[PDB]
């Protein structure tokens, strides 16, 4: 299948991403708390649901939360301000809270069965969010030989993530605070409620930067 692109809500940021975030890839967005990673995840969970003419893929979402940062109220606000039905937007976001790194790995594996069933529907899964990919791995692996073990589990988790994205034509979006993903985006605060995105690593895309805002519509220019 050909690559689908999900608009982030920002024209500037979509331009940097060659149209938007891609299916059949793991897009990693990293930054300090408040850099806009979570607002971008919330905006994408709504945007993917829009028709292609609006920047979406008529798709369903699966969201894995390691730190309880998912906000239904924010999804609802973004949905309403984009002229979508908040109830329908929420019902197309399959949500799961991971309490440890092993639970997190298991949820990715269990998600394959769910995705299979939605493939021939009008709204198949086009987006899988993992916020925030490493929080459990960093807190659990402390002591002698902890670092080498963490790297091994992360690599397998990311391989399980890559497998779903290619096999089912899904865009995998992961967040991180501060490893090989297909696209790395460094996020930081600009001047005001403005953020700056820096494309660090990309195989088909040139390096660069884009500026965006955080509003009642989630993410825009």
UniProtKB/Swiss-Prot annotation:
Involved in DNA repair and in homologous recombination. Binds and assemble on single-stranded DNA to form a nucleoprotein filament. Hydrolyzes ATP in a ssDNA-dependent manner and promotes DNA strand exchange between homologous DNA molecules. This is DNA repair and recombination protein RadA. Signal peptide: none annotated. The chain holds residues 108 to 349 of 349 of the full protein. ATP binds at residues 31-38. The keyword S-adenosyl-L-methionine does not apply. The keyword Nucleotide-binding applies. GO terms for molecular function: ATP binding; ATP hydrolysis activity; ATP-dependent DNA damage sensor activity; damaged DNA binding. Keywords: ATP-binding, DNA damage, DNA recombination, DNA-binding, Nucleotide-binding. Belongs to the eukaryotic RecA-like protein family. Disulfide bonds: none annotated. GO terms for biological process: DNA recombination; DNA repair.
